[PDB]
């Protein structure tokens, strides 16, 4: 006797992570996110004298 097989096959996978961290000292770095863009207009667009 003869015998032939044909195992066709496929997979799939879709991982996802959403890890958030909360170190303490990030708010220290986040104190001046808008300050250095707001005084940029003082540096380049407004008369910095009385």
């Amino acid at each position: 006797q003869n015998a032939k097989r044909n195992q066709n096959q496929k997979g799939n996978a879709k991982g996802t992570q959403f890890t958030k961290q909360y170190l303490i000292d990030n708010i220290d770095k986040a104190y001046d996110l808008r300050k250095k863009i707001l005084n940029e207009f003082d540096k380049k667009c407004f008369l910095q004298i009385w």
């Binding site: 005084n39 003082d42 540096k43 380049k44 407004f46 008369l47 910095q48 004298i49 009385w50």
Partner: protein, 54 residues
Amino acid sequence: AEVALSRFSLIMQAKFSKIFKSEINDESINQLVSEIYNGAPFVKMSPMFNADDD
């Protein structure tokens, strides 16, 4: 002759300017006009390092 050359060349480049340094169009001109050559003490400026050896 060439030592007189060197004296004349030495006193011809012995002249002195006070360079103002700022981004150009009308920030620091009003400063020097109304407050340096008119002799004025107590000139007020912005905190933007504007004379921190500028």
